[PDB]
Amino acid sequence: ANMQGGQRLGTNQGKGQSAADKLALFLKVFGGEVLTAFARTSVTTNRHM
Amino acid sequence: QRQISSGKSAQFPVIGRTKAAYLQPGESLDDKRKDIKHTEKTINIDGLL
Amino acid sequence: QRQISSGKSAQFPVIGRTKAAYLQPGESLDDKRKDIKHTEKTINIDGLL
Numbered sequence: 001a002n003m004q005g006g007q008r009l010g011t012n013q014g015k016g017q018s019a020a021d022k023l024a025l026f027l028k029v030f031g032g033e034v035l036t037a038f039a040r041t042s043v044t045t046n047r048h049m
Numbered sequence: 050q051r052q053i054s055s056g057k058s059a060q061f062p063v064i065g066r067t068k069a070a071y072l073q074p075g076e077s078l079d080d081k082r083k084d085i086k087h088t089e090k091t092i093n094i095d096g097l098l
Numbered sequence: 099q100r101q102i103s104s105g106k107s108a109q110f111p112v113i114g115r116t117k118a119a120y121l122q123p124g125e126s127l128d129d130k131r132k133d134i135k136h137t138e139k140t141i142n143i144d145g146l147l
Contacts, residue, residue: 001129002124002126003125003126006124008124022123026057028057028058028059028060028091029053029054029055029057030059031051031059031060031061031090032052032059033051034061034062034063034064035061035062035063036063036064037064096120096121096122097120098118098119098120
């Protein structure tokens with residue numbers, strides 16, 4: 001069935017830590033691109049003096 | 050479909066526009082400033098499929 | 099419109115699809131593996147018309 005003694009890098013373990021989260025020790029990284037608000041276009045520039 | 054390496058999750062930041070204002074002669078720009086809002090978007094990676 | 103020679107019938111095998119599952123760490127692929135199903139479709143010829 002399930003493997004015995006498998007290496008668990010994510011589990012926090014520790015003396016006082018809960019270790020309930022299986023992904024605790026892993027940390028998030030920056031995504032590829034920063035999200036920016038959509039550009040707003042000017043309409044009146046060529047419509048008056 | 051962006052790609053990352055060695056990450057439990059990926060974070061995407063957003064930027065939130067700004068507003069302009071008039072500066073009278075003798076007024077400091079430091080007295081009227083608002084800043085641009087920031088927050089994050091999280092896409093956490095699932096298990097192995 | 100197939101053509102056969104020296105046969106009382108012709109059989110056409112079929113292949114089904116498969117599904118995907120998430121493999122948690124410490125879980126073997128053998129326990130949750132489901133085989134792709136198989137069966138046949140047979141077209142037996144009749145006598146002389």
